[PDB]
CSV table of C-alpha atoms in Angstrom, one decimal:
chain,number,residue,atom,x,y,z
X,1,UNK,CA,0.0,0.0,0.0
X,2,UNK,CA,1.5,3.4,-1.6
X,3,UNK,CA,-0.1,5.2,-4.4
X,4,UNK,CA,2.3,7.6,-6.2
X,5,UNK,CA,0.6,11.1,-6.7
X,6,UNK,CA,2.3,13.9,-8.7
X,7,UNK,CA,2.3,17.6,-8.8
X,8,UNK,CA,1.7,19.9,-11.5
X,9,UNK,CA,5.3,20.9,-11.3
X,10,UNK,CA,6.9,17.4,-11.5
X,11,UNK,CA,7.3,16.2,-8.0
X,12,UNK,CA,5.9,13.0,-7.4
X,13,UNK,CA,4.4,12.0,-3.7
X,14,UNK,CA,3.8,8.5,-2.1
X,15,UNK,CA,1.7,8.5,0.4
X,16,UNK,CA,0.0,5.5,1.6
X,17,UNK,CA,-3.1,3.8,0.5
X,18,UNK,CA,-4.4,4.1,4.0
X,19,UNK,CA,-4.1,7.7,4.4
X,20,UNK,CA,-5.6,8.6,0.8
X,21,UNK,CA,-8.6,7.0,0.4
X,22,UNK,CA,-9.2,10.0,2.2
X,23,UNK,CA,-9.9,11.9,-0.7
X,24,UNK,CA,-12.9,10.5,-2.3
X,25,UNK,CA,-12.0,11.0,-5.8
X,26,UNK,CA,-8.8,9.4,-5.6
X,27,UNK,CA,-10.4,6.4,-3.6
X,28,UNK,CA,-13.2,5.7,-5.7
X,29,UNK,CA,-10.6,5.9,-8.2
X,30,UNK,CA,-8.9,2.8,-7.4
X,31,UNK,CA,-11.3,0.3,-8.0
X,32,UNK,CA,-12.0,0.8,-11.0
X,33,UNK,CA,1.8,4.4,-12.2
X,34,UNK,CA,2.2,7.8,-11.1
X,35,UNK,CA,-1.4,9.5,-10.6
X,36,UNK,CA,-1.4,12.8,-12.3
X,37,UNK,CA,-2.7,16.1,-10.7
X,38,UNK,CA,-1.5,18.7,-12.8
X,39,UNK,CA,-4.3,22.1,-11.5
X,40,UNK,CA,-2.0,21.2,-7.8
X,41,UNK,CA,1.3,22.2,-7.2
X,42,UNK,CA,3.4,20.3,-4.7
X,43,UNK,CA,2.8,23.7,-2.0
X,44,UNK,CA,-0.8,22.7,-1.3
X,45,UNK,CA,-0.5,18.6,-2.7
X,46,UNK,CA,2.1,18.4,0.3
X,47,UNK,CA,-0.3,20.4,2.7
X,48,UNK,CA,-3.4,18.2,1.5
X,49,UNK,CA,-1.4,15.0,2.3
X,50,UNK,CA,-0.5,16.1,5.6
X,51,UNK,CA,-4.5,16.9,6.8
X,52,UNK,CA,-5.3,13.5,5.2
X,53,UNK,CA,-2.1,11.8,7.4
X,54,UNK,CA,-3.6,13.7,10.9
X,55,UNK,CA,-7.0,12.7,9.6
X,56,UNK,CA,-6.2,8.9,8.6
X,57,UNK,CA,-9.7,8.3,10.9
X,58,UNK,CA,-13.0,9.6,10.3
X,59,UNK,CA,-18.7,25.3,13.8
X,60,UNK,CA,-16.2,24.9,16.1
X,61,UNK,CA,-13.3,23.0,14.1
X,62,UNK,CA,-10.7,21.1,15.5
X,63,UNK,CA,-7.9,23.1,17.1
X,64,UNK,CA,-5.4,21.3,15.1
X,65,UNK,CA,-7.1,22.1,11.5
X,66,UNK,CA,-8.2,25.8,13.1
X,67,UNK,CA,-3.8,26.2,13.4
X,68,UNK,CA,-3.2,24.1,10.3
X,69,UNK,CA,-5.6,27.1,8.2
X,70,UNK,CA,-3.6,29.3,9.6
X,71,UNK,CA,-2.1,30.1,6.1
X,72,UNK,CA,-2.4,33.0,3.5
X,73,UNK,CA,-5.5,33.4,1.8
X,74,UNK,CA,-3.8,32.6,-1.5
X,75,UNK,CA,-2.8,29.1,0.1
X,76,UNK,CA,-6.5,28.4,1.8
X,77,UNK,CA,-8.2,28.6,-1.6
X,78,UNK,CA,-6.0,26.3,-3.6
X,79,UNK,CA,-6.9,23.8,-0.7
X,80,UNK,CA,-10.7,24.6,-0.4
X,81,UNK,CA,-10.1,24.1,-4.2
X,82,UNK,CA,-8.4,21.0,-3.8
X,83,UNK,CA,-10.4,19.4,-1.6
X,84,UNK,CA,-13.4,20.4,-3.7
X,85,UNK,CA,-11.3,18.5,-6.5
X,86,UNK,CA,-10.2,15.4,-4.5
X,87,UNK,CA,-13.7,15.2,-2.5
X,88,UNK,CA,-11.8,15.1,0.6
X,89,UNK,CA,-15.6,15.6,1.5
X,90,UNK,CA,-13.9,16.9,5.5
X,91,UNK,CA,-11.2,19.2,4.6
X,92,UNK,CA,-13.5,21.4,2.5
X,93,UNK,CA,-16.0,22.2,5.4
X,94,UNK,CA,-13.4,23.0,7.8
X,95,UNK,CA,-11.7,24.9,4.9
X,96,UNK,CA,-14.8,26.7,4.1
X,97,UNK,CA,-15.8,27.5,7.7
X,98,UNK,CA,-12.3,29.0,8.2
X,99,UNK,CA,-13.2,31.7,5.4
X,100,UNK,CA,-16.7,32.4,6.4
X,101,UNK,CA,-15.6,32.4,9.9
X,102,UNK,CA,-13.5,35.6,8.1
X,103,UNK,CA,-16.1,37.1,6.5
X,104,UNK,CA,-18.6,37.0,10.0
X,105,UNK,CA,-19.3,39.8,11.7
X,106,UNK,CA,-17.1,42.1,9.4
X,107,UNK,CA,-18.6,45.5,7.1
X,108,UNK,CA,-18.9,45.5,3.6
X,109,UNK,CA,-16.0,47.9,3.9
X,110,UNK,CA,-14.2,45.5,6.2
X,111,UNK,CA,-15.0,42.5,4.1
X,112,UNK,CA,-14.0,44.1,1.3
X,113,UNK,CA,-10.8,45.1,2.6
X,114,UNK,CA,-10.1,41.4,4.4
X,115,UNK,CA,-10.3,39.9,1.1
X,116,UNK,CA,-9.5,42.7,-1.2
X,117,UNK,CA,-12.1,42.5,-3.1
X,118,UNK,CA,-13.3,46.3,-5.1
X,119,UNK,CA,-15.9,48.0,-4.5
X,120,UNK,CA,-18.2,47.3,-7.7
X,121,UNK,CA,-21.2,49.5,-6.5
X,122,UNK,CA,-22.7,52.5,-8.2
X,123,UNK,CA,-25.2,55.1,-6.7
X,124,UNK,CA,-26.9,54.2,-3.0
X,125,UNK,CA,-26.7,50.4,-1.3
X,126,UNK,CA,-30.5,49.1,-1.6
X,127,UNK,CA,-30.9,49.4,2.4
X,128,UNK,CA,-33.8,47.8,3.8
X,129,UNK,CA,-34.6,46.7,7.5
X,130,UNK,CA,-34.7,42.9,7.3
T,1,UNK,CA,-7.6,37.9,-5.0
T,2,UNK,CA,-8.2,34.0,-5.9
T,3,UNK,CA,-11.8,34.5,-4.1
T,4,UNK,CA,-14.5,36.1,-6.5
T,5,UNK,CA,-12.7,33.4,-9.2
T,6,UNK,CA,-13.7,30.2,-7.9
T,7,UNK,CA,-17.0,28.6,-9.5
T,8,UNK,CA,-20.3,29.6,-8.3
T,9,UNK,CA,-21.4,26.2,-6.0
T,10,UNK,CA,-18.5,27.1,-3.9
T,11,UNK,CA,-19.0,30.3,-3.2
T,12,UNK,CA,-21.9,29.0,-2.4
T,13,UNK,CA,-21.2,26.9,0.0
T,14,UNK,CA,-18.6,29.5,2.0
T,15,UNK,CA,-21.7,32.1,1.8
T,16,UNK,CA,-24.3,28.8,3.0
T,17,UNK,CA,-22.4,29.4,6.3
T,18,UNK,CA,-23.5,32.6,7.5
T,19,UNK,CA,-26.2,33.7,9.4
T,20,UNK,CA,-29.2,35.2,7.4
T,21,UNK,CA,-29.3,38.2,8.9
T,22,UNK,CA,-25.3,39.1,7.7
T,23,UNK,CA,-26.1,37.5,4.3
T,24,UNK,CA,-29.1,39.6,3.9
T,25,UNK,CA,-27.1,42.7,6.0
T,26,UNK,CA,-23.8,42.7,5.0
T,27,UNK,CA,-23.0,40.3,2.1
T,28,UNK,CA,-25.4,41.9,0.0
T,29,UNK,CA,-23.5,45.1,0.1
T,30,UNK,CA,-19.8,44.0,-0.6
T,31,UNK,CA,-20.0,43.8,-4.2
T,32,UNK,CA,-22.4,43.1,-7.2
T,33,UNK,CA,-22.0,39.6,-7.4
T,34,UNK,CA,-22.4,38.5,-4.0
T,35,UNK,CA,-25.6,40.8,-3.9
T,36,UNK,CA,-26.8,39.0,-7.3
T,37,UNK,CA,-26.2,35.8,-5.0
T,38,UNK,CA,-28.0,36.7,-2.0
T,39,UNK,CA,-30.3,36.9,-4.0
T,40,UNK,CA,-30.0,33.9,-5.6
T,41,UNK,CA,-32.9,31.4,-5.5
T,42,UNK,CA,-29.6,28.4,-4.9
T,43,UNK,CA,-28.0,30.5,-1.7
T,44,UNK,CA,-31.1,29.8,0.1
T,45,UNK,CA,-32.0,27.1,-0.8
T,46,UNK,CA,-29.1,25.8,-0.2
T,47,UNK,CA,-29.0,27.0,3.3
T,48,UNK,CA,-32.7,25.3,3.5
T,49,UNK,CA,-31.4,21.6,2.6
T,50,UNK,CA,-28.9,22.3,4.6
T,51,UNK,CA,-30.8,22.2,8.1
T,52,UNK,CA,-34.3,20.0,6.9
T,53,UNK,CA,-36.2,23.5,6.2
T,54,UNK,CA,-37.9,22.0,3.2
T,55,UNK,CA,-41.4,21.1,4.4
T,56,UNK,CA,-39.1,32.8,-3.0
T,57,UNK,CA,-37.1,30.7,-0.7
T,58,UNK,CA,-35.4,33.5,1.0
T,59,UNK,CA,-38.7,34.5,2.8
T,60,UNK,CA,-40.1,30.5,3.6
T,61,UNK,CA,-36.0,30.2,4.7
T,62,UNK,CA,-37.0,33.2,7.5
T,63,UNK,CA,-40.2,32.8,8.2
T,64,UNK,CA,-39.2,28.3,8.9
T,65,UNK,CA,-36.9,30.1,11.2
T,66,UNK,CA,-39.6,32.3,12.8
T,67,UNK,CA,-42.1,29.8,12.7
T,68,UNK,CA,-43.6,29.1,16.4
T,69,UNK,CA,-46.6,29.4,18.3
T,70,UNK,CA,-46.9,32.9,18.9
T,71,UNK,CA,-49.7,32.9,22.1
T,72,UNK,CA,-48.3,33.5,25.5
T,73,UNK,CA,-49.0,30.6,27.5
T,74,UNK,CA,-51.5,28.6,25.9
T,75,UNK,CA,-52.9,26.6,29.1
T,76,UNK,CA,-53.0,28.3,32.0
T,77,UNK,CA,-49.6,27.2,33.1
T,78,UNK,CA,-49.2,30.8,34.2
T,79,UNK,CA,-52.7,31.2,35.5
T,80,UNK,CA,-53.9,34.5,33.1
T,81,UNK,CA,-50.5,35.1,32.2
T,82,UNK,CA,-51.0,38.1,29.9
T,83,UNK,CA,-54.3,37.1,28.8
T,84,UNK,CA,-56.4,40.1,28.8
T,85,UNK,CA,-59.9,42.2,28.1
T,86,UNK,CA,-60.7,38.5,30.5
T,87,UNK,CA,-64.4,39.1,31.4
T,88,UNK,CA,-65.3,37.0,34.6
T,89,UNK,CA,-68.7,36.3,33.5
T,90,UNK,CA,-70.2,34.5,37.1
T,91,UNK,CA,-67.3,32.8,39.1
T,92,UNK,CA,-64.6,33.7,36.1
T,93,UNK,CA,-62.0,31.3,35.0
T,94,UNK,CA,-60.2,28.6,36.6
T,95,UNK,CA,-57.6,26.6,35.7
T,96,UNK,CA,-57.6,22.7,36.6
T,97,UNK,CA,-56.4,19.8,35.5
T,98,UNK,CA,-56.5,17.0,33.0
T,99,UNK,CA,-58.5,15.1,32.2
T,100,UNK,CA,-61.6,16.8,33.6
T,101,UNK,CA,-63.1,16.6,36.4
T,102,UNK,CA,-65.6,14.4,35.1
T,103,UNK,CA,-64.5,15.1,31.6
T,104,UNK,CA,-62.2,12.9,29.2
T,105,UNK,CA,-57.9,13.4,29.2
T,106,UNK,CA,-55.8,15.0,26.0
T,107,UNK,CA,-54.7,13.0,22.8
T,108,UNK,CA,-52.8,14.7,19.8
T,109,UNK,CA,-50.4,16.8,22.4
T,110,UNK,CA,-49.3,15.3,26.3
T,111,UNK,CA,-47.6,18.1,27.5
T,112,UNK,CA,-50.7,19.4,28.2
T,113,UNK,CA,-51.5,19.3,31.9
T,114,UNK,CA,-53.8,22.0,32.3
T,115,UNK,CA,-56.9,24.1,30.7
T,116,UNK,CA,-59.7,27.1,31.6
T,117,UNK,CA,-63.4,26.3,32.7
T,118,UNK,CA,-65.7,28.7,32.9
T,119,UNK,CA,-68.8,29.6,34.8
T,120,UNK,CA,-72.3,30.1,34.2
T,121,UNK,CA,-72.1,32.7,32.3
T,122,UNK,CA,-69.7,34.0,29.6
T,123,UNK,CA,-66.0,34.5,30.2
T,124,UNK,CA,-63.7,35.2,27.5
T,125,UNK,CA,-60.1,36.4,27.0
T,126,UNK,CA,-58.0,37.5,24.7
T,127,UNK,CA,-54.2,38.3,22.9
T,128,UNK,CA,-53.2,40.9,20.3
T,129,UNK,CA,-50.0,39.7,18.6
T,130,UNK,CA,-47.6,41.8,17.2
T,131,UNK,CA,-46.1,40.9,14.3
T,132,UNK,CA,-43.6,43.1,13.9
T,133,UNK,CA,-42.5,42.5,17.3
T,134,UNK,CA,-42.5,39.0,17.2
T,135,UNK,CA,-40.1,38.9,13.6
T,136,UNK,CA,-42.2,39.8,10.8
T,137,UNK,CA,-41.8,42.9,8.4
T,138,UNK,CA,-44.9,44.9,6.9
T,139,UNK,CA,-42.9,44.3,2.8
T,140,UNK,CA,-43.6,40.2,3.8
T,141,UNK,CA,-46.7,41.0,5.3
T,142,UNK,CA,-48.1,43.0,2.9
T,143,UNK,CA,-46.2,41.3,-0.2
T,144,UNK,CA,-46.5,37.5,0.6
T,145,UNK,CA,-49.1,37.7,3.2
T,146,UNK,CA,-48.0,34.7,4.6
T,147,UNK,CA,-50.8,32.0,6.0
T,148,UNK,CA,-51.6,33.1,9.5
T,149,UNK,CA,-53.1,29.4,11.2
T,150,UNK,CA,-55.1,30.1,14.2
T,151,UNK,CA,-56.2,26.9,16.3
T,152,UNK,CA,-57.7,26.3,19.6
T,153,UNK,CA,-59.3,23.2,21.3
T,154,UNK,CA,-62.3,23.1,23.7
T,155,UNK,CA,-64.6,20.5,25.1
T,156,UNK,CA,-67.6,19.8,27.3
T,157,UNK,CA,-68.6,18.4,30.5
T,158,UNK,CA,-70.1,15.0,30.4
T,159,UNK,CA,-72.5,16.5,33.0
T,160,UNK,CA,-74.0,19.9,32.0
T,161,UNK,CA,-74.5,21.4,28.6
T,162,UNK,CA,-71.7,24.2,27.7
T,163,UNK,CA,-71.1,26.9,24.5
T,164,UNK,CA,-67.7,28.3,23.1
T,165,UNK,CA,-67.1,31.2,20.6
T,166,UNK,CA,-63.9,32.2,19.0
T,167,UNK,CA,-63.4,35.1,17.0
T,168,UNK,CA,-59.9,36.2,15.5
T,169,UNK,CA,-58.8,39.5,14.0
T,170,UNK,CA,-56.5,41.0,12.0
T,171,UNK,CA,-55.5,44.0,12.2
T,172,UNK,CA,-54.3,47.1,10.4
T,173,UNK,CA,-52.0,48.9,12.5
T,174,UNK,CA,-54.8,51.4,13.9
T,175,UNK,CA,-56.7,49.1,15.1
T,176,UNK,CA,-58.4,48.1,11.7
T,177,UNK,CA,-60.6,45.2,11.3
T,178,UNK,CA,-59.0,44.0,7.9
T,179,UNK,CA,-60.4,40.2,8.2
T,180,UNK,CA,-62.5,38.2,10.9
T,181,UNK,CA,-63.3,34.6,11.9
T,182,UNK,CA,-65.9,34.6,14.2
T,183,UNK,CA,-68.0,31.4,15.1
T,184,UNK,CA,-71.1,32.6,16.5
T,185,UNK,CA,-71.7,30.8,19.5
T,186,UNK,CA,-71.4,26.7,19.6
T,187,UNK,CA,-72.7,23.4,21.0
T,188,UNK,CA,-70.2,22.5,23.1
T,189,UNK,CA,-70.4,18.7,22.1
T,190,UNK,CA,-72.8,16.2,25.2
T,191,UNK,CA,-70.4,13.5,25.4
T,192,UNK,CA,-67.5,16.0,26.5
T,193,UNK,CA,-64.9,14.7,23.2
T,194,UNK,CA,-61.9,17.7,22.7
T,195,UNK,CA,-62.9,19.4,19.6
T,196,UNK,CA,-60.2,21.6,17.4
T,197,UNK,CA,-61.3,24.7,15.8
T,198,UNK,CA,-59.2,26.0,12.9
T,199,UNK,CA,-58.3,29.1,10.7
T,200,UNK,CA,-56.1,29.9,8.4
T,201,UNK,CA,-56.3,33.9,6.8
T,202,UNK,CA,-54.6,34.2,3.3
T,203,UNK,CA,-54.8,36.5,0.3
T,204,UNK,CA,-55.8,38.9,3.3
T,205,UNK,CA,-54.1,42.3,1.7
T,206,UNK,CA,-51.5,44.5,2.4
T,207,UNK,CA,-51.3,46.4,6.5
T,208,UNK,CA,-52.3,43.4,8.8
T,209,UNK,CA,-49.5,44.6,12.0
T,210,UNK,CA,-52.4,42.6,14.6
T,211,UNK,CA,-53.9,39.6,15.3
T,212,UNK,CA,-56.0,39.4,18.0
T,213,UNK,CA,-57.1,36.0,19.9
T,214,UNK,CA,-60.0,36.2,21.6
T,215,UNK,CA,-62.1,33.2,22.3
T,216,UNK,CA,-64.6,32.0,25.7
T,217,UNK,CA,-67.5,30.2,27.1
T,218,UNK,CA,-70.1,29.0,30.1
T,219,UNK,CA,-72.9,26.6,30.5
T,220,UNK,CA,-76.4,25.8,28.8
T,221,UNK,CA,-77.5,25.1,32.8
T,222,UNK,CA,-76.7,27.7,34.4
T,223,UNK,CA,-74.8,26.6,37.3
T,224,UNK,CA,-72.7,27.8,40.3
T,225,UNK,CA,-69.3,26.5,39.8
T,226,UNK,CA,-67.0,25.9,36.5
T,227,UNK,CA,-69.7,23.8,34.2
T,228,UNK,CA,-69.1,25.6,31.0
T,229,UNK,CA,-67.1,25.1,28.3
T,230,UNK,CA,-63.4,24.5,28.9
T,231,UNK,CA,-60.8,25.4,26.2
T,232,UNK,CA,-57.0,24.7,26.0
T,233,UNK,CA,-53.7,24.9,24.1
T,234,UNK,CA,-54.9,27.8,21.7
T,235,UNK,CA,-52.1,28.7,19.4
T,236,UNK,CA,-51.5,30.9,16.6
T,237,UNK,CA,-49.2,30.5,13.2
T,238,UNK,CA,-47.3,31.9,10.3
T,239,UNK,CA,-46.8,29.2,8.0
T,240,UNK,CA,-44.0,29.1,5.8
């Protein structure tokens, strides 16, 4: 048990059979040699195969994963875009939360600057009570 | 950055995450697209499915949330705990217990313990309900005029001969009788069986800020004591 697993810039990973599996869409995969993944580079494919090694079981979110996320936006999407990808059906919650739980309780000012996204509005807001 | 280029269902399910009242507050004002998606039909939903909701989803999403009896102590749990306009026709209200003395127990609800009996002559009380202060906004009201459901149960003495009325309003913020349910006064069934009156007010119009509960009874025999018509467990709905 060791499936090879390779990054969009070359490098190739073996990680156990046991550990995948953990991603969905690599597991169902197998039924059904260097596995491809070239829309991951080896930054987040390394980071991906560490949360499935702590997770080789299976609000709030585990303290662990809340300090794993602890990354650069950048670096969360490409996971919550992985995960997505590889159906690691529990990383992507917890990767998800982790952003929302940055968006909650901010302004539209706030939010906007958080996650630096522009301003796109014309004229008024559309405020309503409600 | 990498965020607002990531596809739709995602977003989605980051968004799904947050309380209503930012997504409807907040989100909606960050940029165009988020708004657009606020306003999507698929957030919501979404969001529904996501915790059982499903029996404009937006509006059912809120109002699933809001959803609850909205009469103050149904029972008498709390004697006349903000009952009010109570007339004490002969020796008034009292509460006592299930089943009745001499008078059959509940069925479809057993957290019921307890219920009003009335005298020899006509008690009734009543409830207003505000709307607005219980959750719900005059552009639903007036716009979806969601199903208002208004139920109460009543029964007899095996004994003596009894009479109950009920008769619902709603209301247009000065006090404006905009639709009724009355039922005239009725034969509190012999046998003492619980009987469950319904209504439920739709299409009503646009201004209803009220409802008012008022329901009562007393006896056919006209006796010293509590031998007319006992009601219980009177509740009041809006229905997503």
């Amino acid at each position: 048990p060791s499936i090879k697993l390779q990054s969009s810039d070359g490098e190739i990973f073996e990680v156990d059979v046991e550990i995948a599996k953990q991603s969905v869409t690599i597991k169902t995969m197998l039924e059904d040699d260097p596995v491809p993944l070239p829309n991951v580079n080896a930054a987040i494919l390394k980071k991906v195969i560490q949360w499935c090694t702590h997770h080789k079981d299976d609000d709030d979110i585990p303290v662990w994963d809340q300090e794993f996320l602890k990354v650069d936006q950048g670096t969360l999407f490409e996971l919550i875009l992985a995960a997505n990808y590889l159906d690691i059906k529990g990383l992507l919650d917890v990767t998800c939360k982790t952003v929302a739980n940055m968006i909650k309780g901010k302004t539209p000012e706030e939010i906007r600057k958080t996650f630096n996204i522009k301003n796109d509005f014309t004229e008024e807001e559309e405020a309503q009570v409600r | 950055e990498y965020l607002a280029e990531l596809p739709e269902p995602l977003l989605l399910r980051v968004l799904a995450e947050l309380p209503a009242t930012e997504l409807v507050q907040a989100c909606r004002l960050v940029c165009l697209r988020w708004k657009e998606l606020v306003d999507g039909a698929p957030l919501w939903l979404l969001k529904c499915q996501q915790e059982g909701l499903v029996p404009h989803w937006q509006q059912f999403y809120f109002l699933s949330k809001r959803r609850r009896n909205l009469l103050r102590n149904p029972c008498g749990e709390e004697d006349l705990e903000g009952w009010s306009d109570v007339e004490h026709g002969g020796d008034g209200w009292k509460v006592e217990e299930l089943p009745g003395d001499n008078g059959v127990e509940f069925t479809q609800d057993d957290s019921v313990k307890k219920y009003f009996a009335s005298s020899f002559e006509w008690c009734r009380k009543a409830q207003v309900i505000d709307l607005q202060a219980e959750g719900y906004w005059e552009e639903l009201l007036d716009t979806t005029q969601p199903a208002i459901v208004v139920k109460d149960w009543y029964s007899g003495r095996t004994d003596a001969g009894s009479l109950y009325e009920l008769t619902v309003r709603l209301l247009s913020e000065n006090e404006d009788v905009l639709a009724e349910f009355a039922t005239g006064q009725v034969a509190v069934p012999e046998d003492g069986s619980w009987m469950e009156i319904s209504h439920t007010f739709i299409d009503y119009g646009p201004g209803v800020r009220f409802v008012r509960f008022e329901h009562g009874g007393q006896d056919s025999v006209y006796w010293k004591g509590w031998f007319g018509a006992r009601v219980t467990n009177s509740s009041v709905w809006v229905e997503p």
